Structures are given as structure tokens and as C-alpha cells.
């Protein structure tokens, strides 16, 4: 079977301003949709170090064998549709149930300032691009 080896996932969280986690829908890649992924966001930070930030992680929900190696990039789509505030990974080794990401992905006060155009209509749109190399 063929494999989806690169994929880009777009997720809009409504009423954003409203260590606790929001998890995205699960999305599939690989052969026969056998790699399953989701995004995890901590809107108020992972911990004390990151209180002032949103934290963002890519989680390998399911895989058929031992491990998956993948490179990834996260960004925000602004009120115009443009990518902004990107952070990118080398390939990292994921195992099922494990994640990789940025505990200090973006500052909350920047995100919540309407001047920046990152929460049009109080919606946060995240964009994750993944390239699976093994």
C-alpha cells in the first residue's frame, strides 16, 4: 500500500479567550491510515515556567510498529489567512502515546491583543505540517 508521508492539519478553536489540555480531533497518515495523530494545546501553559504561554504538542496516538520519526512545524493563521509565528523542529522519534512540542509556543498577552490579528472573531487557527521520514 501507498503511504501519506507529508500532511498539513488546520484546527480552529472557537471562543479562545474563554496544565489542563484541549485535544484536537485525530488525523491519520501512513499506510491504510494506520498512523494516528492529534494536537494537544495547554491554553494557559504546561506549568509554572510556561504560565504566560500557550503550549502546543504533536501526539502520536497510534502506530503499528515501534516508532515513527517525523519533522514538524507549527504556526498560526492570522485574520488574513497568512502563516505567522512559526516554530519548527530535525526529525524526532515518536512512540505511541508520546508527544513533542513547544511549552512556550506563543505568549498569551500577544495572542490576546486584538492589534495582532491572531484571534479574529475570538478564534485561534493553528496549522501543523508534518513530514514522516521513517
Amino acid at each position: 500500500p501507498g503511504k501519506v508521508v507529508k500532511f498539513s492539519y488546520m484546527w480552529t478553536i472557537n471562543n479562545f479567550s474563554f496544565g489542563e489540555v484541549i485535544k484536537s480531533s485525530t488525523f491519520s497518515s501512513g499506510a491504510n491510515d494506520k498512523l494516528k495523530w492529534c494536537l494537544r494545546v495547554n491554553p494557559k501553559g504546561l506549568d509554572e515556567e510556561s504560565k504566560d504561554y500557550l503550549s502546543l504538542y504533536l501526539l502520536l496516538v497510534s502506530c503499528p510498529k515501534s516508532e515513527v520519526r517525523a519533522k514538524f512545524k507549527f504556526s498560526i493563521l492570522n485574520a488574513k489567512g497568512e502563516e505567522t509565528k512559526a516554530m519548527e523542529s530535525r526529525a524526532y522519534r515518536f512512540v505511541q502515546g508520546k508527544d513533542w512540542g513547544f511549552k512556550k509556543f506563543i505568549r498569551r498577552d500577544f495572542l490576546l491583543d486584538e492589534a495582532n490579528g491572531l484571534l479574529p472573531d475570538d478564534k485561534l487557527t493553528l496549522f501543523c505540517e508534518v513530514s514522516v521520514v521513517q
Partner: peptide, 7 residues
């Protein structure tokens, strides 16, 4: 600033 797991 490098990726880390959440747990």
C-alpha cells in the same frame, strides 16, 4: 526552545 515532550 527545542521540542520536548509534555510529560
Amino acid at each position: 526552545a527545542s521540542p520536548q515532550p509534555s510529560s
